[PDB]
Amino acid sequence: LKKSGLCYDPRMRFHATLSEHPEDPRRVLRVFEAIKKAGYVSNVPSPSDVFLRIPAREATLEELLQVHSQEMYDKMSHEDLANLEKISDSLYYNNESAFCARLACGSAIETCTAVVTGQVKNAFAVVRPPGHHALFNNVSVTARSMLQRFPDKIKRVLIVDWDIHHGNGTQMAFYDDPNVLYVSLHRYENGRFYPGTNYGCAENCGEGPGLGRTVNIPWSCAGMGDGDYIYAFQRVVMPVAYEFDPDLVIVSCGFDAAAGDHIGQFLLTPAAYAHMTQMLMGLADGKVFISLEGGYNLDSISTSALAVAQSLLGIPPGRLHTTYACPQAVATINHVTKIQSQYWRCMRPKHFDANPKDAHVDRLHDVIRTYQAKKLFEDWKITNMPILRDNNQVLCSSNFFQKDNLLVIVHESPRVLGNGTSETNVLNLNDSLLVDPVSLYVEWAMQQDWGLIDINIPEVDILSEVKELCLYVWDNYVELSISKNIFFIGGGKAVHGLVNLASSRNVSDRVKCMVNFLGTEPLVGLKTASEEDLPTWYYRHSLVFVSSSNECWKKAKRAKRRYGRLMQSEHTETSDMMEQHYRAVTQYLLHLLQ
Amino acid sequence: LKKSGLCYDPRMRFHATLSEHPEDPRRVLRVFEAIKKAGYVSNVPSPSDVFLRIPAREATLEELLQVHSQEMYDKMSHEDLANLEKISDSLYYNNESAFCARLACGSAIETCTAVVTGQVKNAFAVVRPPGHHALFNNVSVTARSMLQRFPDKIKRVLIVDWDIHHGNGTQMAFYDDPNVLYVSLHRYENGRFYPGTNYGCAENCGEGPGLGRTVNIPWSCAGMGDGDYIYAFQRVVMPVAYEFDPDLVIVSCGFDAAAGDHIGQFLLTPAAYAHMTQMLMGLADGKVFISLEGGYNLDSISTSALAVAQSLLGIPPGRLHTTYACPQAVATINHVTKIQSQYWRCMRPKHFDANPKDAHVDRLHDVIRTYQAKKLFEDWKITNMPILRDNNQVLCSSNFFQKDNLLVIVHESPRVLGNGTSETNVLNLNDSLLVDPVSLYVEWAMQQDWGLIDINIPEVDILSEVKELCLYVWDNYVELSISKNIFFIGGGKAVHGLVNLASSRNVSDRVKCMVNFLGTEPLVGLKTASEEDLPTWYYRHSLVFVSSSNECWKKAKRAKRRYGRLMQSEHTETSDMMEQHYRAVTQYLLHLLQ
Ligand SMILES: [K+]
Ligand SMILES: [K+]
Ligand SMILES: [K+]
Ligand SMILES: [K+]
Ligand SMILES: [Mg+2]
Ligand SMILES: [Mg+2]
Ligand SMILES: [Zn+2]
Ligand SMILES: [Zn+2]
Ligand SMILES: [Zn+2]
Ligand SMILES: [Zn+2]
């Protein structure tokens, strides 16, 4: 059983000389101390230590010139030639902090070499550069160096970057390179978060030969945690890594996504870093190299770094805080999957696109409503109810205005269940189903010889359009009808239109009941100055079906009449409410007519 | 760093006495020898061995009575009481093979105990019972025993069964138990494969409290391999395991799914077993217990068992043979995901169902075609072309029969791109798109003032209906028309109808060209006795667009005229062929009219 490698050269006394090294020198000190306290390493290196001590190194000028030059060798371009002045000033500049730059760069190469040569199973370099956190960086220099020196063993390198910041430099260094896969999880927020570039967006997958060898997972907000990252690793990172089949894994291992870090504002516990490390160790014959990066909380760095070290040694990881991925996270991973399905066999289903502006392309919203309008005309002579504004959105039965009883149904679009091959988003039209419970009420209303009006609510402010359309239909058609007994059945966001109608018009005379199948819509009530009369009427002339998981249960203290008569439903979806409460509701409205 | 456990008690001399022990005694011998040859264990157990030797044990009568009885204790039922006669005959029956039953059962409990108590990190029991492979079995007895003896540490047990046979007994023993999660990958084939029961189907998820705590992955055929199993582990097994959060992992570790096993006929290499083991070791604080089970090839058992042992010791696993999952496998995992999304947060999207027999439920096939028929009537007065048989399937322009030029388009249903929340199979009707390139030709044909006929092919023998419908339309409408210049445009399986038409009717007179956008449909040609005249005509009056990945390229030797003039297309899908070749094809057909 091979030992793991550990490179550490703090130089605390030398670091006490520096003034005006933004890098905190006690960062590496705290990491080493935590590993030592656990008993994995000693101040005096012993053959009993499970960590093999690897001596730190200074990167030489000739060494670094080879990296920048040999890759150019592997058509010719003068602007692509190695520049001695620039390469030198990065290694030997005026300030004495230059020593740390040389030591950090060289030690990364030396430590990773110990892994590639098989001297150790894996390694952890705890040697930091002087400059700020977030011309090749250490990870890039190391990656390129291994590909060059050991071409018979290393032909593909995987770079996993789980620092909360996107590595612009690392990505750009291999953006055209197909043999180096760069994977990055980072806080993005539409490119607002540091470095504030759009370069780390999900759409950037590489270019030229390196197309499909850059994978970005840009989180859209703060507060991501254990479940979110393990979710991303199980659904994206590990499947892609297995397909890439790397010969070497290098981790840009920052800890500013850890709980306690005030900059990153994420909630990763040490166990998350232990699990991620352990997963990666299944790759590349175990050849994993950890490079210490960012982090702003010494305690978070200490505990998280210990967890990473423990996984390298084969110590079992702890229990995750949670395996629950929040909606923002899964939406991000869905977006990533759609993009990445173009380049990776394991990312499915493949997402095909089309332009609604094209003449031969139509949104299903219009397709479904047109179908309904056609079916209803053939069966009942139901026709379009015109809405003057500055088609088939509103439908009505013939001679609806001459019936004693009138039903007005206000609903969002129907349920359509998409089924087919799970290889793409193309649907099987035989197995895909239109589920239209509203039609049960339409059918029923016609059988009773009631007048009927059917309003289809539009989808993506939006409530403004819903409220106005309900008022329009009321003022222009329902109000001017003969019906003595008017009924309303609402679905979802239709509730906003109906309660606003009851608050804006004198409906108490002719409206006998207002049913509302909320579904996943949060409960809302009347908004009126009428303290007594109106809220009492609404409560006595309504049925508001609520699920056990409605948002009104998170602060369920107020029992107001203006919320209407609340009714319990077993079903969370509006569609299921309408279908299942169909019998009970229809019979209830008939009995109201006596 | 804790050692791993190894229990081994071959008793070769005792086993030489048995005659007429179906279990092959050299099974355990080959496993131990392979581990020893690698240098992980010695004949004379040493403190230097990375495997700690755990002494074998006989299961006692009182011990086993506690298991069967204590679970009954944890309402009352006489038929649920422990029976002393049965429990005894299983441990002490007449034949001397009884000793092996006691030794195997006791050693499993002892070995697993060493893991739970933390004496070892993990363990591998290499002690086998006498009976055939595939009243609690060893895995079940062990699982229940740990839950009973160490209730403060073990409250949830995960059982992973990757023997190719379903463990009917294990499943049935915990089917109502929510604290024991049973996961099984097995060759099923509609319950034809041994044990030949439907008990291992994907739909059986448990019952009572144990509902949602049984997960079956039933492979539908032979030949599953590395990519298929790692696919199943990444998409199903590990996500569910992480959500269950077991305190102990027990592996029913059979090797009859290994390459070389003539019974299982699967292709798992040793690396697949190494990777699966390594993944599971991330769970339950590393508390993993391997129980040796089935396998019919001693060499396959030897190499695969070595791989499992190596993972327990923390040795990096080898490279997989492939990460490619075959269509049968992904279809199985899709099926599993749909079922399991009812009980597990991590299995998404949730699958909702509906009954097309219901009056308010319609298949999208009919919805889309009805929409097309409506849109075309409003725009061009295109109407239904009746098909007498013992609606809107066939559409035609008004006075199509009085035009000099006539276009007949034969097509499968249009492309519909399903988009929305990836939490369910419910579609967002705003983002979901109907993509109908056939309408480009319809529009174009009307602009040219050509006659038009549009035939929609049905979906799921099936080719019989396609061929007959084409002949019907020809004999009844196209044949009897005035058009001197007839054109055919086919899509997908429509090719079968068009080539059959050219072979069954005298089309040489009036038909000027027959276009076919194959897409993913394999190339087919004429089937006629006419050796010269007909195949020559078809070649000179056709355009057959073929993708680079058509099935005709796997044996592409014959260049026949009866296949038609083959044309190259960049696009694999019929829909993309029609849209992209639209300009070139329309202009080509116009030039034919001179
Ligand atoms: K990153
Ligand atoms: K790259
Ligand atoms: K099994
Ligand atoms: K169970
Ligand atoms: Mg359009
Ligand atoms: Mg139906
Ligand atoms: Zn320094
Ligand atoms: Zn950072
Ligand atoms: Zn035996
Ligand atoms: Zn078996």
Q: How big is the CA angle at A420 (ends A414 and A424), to the nearest 5 degrees? A: 105
- Which chain A positions have a beta carbon within 8 Å of B434's beta carbon? 361-364, 367
What residue numbers bound the domain in which A31 lies?
4-341
Instruction: Name the residues around ion ligand 5, CB cutoff 5 A.
Output: A 356, 361
- Which chain A positions have a beta carbon within 8 Å of B41's beta carbon? none
Interface check A423 vs B, CB under 8 A? yes
Tell me if B242 and A443 make a contact (CB, 8 A cut-off): no
Residue B544 pairs with which residues in a beta bridge? B516, B566
Cβ-contact B164, B294 below 8 angstroms: yes
- Output the CA–CA distances (angstroms, integers) from residue A118 to A111, A122, A242, B275, in the order listed: 11, 9, 21, 20
The tokens describing B256, both together, are: 């009859």
Residue A40 pairs with which residues in a beta bridge? none
Nearest-Cα residue of chain A relative to residue B314: A314
The tokens describing B152, both together, are: 């403060």
Binning chain A into helix, strand and coil, the percentages to the nearest 5 are 40, 15, 45
Helix, coil or strand: residue A324: coil
Cβ-contact A142, A110 below 8 angstroms: no
- Which chain B positions have a beta carbon within 8 Å of A239's beta carbon? 234
Chain A interface mutation, best of B4, B248, B351, B367, highest count of A Cβ atoms under 10 Å: B367
3-state secondary structure B287-313: CEEEEECCCCCHHHHHHHHHHHHHHHC
Tell me if B313 and A370 make a contact (CB, 8 A cut-off): no
Q: What is the dihedral of CA A57, A61, A64, A68, to 10 degrees?
A: 170
Residues 92-151 on A with a CB inside 8 Å of B are 121
* Ligand located closest to B194 CA: 10
Nearest-Cα residue of chain B relative to residue A413: B429
- Output the CA–CA distances (angstroms, integers) from residue A13 to A57, A95, A327, in the order listed: 18, 17, 49
Helix, coil or strand: residue A512: strand
Chain A interface mutation, best of B416, B436, B586, highest count of A Cβ atoms under 10 Å: B416
- Which chain B positions have a beta carbon within 8 Å of A422's beta carbon? 330, 334
- Which chain B positions have a beta carbon within 8 Å of A315's beta carbon? 1, 286
Interface check A379 vs B, CB under 8 A? no
CB-nearest to A282 from B50, B317, B345 is B317
Nearest-Cα residue of chain B relative to residue A415: B426
* CATH for B228: 3.40.800.20
Tell me if A430 and B363 make a contact (CB, 8 A cut-off): yes
**Other CB atoms within 10 A of residue A30 CB:** 19
Could you tell me how far CA B459 lies from the centroid of its own chain? Answer: 22
The helix (H) or strand (E) run that includes residue B340 is helix B327-340
The tokens describing A464, both together, are: 């403004």
Tell me if A361 and B443 make a contact (CB, 8 A cut-off): no
DSSP state of A452: E
- Which chain A positions have a beta carbon within 8 Å of B420's beta carbon? 418
Resolution (A): 2.4
Cβ-contact A133, A87 below 8 angstroms: no
Residue B542 pairs with which residues in a beta bridge? B514
Positions of A marked active-site: 133
CA of A315 to the centre of ligand 1 (A): 25
- Which chain A positions have a beta carbon within 8 Å of B314's beta carbon? 1, 314
CB-nearest to A324 from B285, B334, B345 is B345
- Output the CA–CA distances (angstroms, integers) from residue A441 to A447, A488, B543, in the order listed: 10, 11, 52
Residues 445-474 on B with a CB inside 8 Å of A are 459-460
Could you tell me how far CA A567 lies from the centroid of its own chain? Answer: 35
- Output the CA–CA distances (angstroms, integers) from residue A258 to A133, A184, A221, A224, in the order listed: 16, 16, 15, 10
CA of B166 to the centre of ligand 3 (A): 4
- Which chain B positions have a beta carbon within 8 Å of A435's beta carbon? 354, 360-361
Alpha carbon of B429: minimum distance to chain A alpha carbons (Å)? 5
What secondary structure does DSSP assign to B107-152, as a single string? HHHHHHHHHHTTSSSEEEEE---SS------HHHHHHHHHHHH-TT
CA A532, CA B38: separation in Å to the nearest integer?
A: 87
Chain A interface mutation, best of B362, B412, B438, B586, highest count of A Cβ atoms under 10 Å: B362
Cβ-contact B440, B579 below 8 angstroms: yes
Cβ-contact A277, A289 below 8 angstroms: no
Cβ neighbours of residue B237 under 8 Å, at least 6 residues apart?
Answer: B160, B183, B185, B215, B217, B279
CA A563, CA A424: separation in Å to the nearest integer?
A: 44
Positions of B marked active-site: 133
CA B200, CA B198: separation in Å to the nearest integer?
A: 5
3-state secondary structure A216-242: EEEECCCCCEHHHHHHHHHHHHHHHHH
Cβ neighbours of residue B341 under 8 Å, at least 6 residues apart?
Answer: B347, B348, B349, B350, B351
- Which chain B positions have a beta carbon within 8 Å of A278's beta carbon? 281-282
Give backbone dihedrals phi and psi of A486, rounded to 5 degrees, phi first: -105, 135
Cβ neighbours of residue A461 under 8 Å, at least 6 residues apart?
Answer: none
Interface check B429 vs A, CB under 8 A? yes
Cβ-contact A82, A65 below 8 angstroms: yes
CB-nearest to A367 from B334, B354, B371 is B371
Residue type, position B575, single letter: S
Nearest-Cα residue of chain A relative to residue B414: A429
CB-nearest to B324 from A50, A345, A425 is A345
Interface check A367 vs B, CB under 8 A? yes
Tell me if A417 and B432 make a contact (CB, 8 A cut-off): no
Tell me if A364 and B313 make a contact (CB, 8 A cut-off): no
CA of B23 to the centre of ligand 9 (A): 7
CA B271, CA B319: separation in Å to the nearest integer?
A: 6
Tell me if A418 and B426 make a contact (CB, 8 A cut-off): yes
Interface check B363 vs A, CB under 8 A? yes
Tell me if B423 and A245 make a contact (CB, 8 A cut-off): no
- Which chain A positions have a beta carbon within 8 Å of B240's beta carbon? none
CA B99, CA B107: separation in Å to the nearest integer?
A: 12
Residue type, position A96, single letter: E
Nearest-Cα residue of chain B relative to residue A40: B1
- Output the CA–CA distances (angstroms, integers) from residue B345 to A326, B62, B240, in the order listed: 11, 41, 8
The tokens describing A467, both together, are: 């409220």
What secondary structure does DSSP assign to A343-394, as a single string? T-TTS-SB-----TTSTTEEEHHHHHHHHHHHHHHHHH--EE--------SE
CA B530, CA B69: separation in Å to the nearest integer?
A: 81
Could you tell me how far CA B238 lies from the centroid of its own chain? Answer: 17
Tell me if B314 and A1 make a contact (CB, 8 A cut-off): yes
Cβ-contact A435, A577 below 8 angstroms: no
CB-nearest to B316 from A285, A361, A425 is A285
CA B193, CA B172: separation in Å to the nearest integer?
A: 18
Cβ neighbours of residue A577 under 8 Å, at least 6 residues apart?
Answer: A491, A517, A518, A519, A545, A569, A571
Instruction: Name the residues around ion ligand 1, CB cutoff 5 A.
Output: A 161, 163, 184, 186
CA B75, CA B63: separation in Å to the nearest integer?
A: 24
Cβ-contact A498, A463 below 8 angstroms: no
Give the technique used to solve this structure. X-ray
User: Which of B416, B427, B209, B239 shows the shortest CA–CA distance to B337?
Assistant: B239
Cβ neighbours of residue A465 under 8 Å, at least 6 residues apart?
Answer: A458
The tokens describing B124, both together, are: 């591998």
Interface check A285 vs B, CB under 8 A? yes
CA of B209 to the centre of ligand 4 (A): 9
CA A430, CA A310: separation in Å to the nearest integer?
A: 53
> Sign (positive/negative) of CA torsion A538, A539, A544, A547?
positive
Interface check A361 vs B, CB under 8 A? yes
Interface check B245 vs A, CB under 8 A? yes
Cβ-contact B157, B182 below 8 angstroms: no
Place of tokens 């057909």: B589
Cβ-contact B513, B542 below 8 angstroms: yes
* Ligand located closest to A171 CA: 2
Helix axis angle, B582-592 relative to B438-447, nearest 10°?
40
Helix, coil or strand: residue A289: strand
Helix, coil or strand: residue B229: helix
Cβ-contact A194, A165 below 8 angstroms: yes
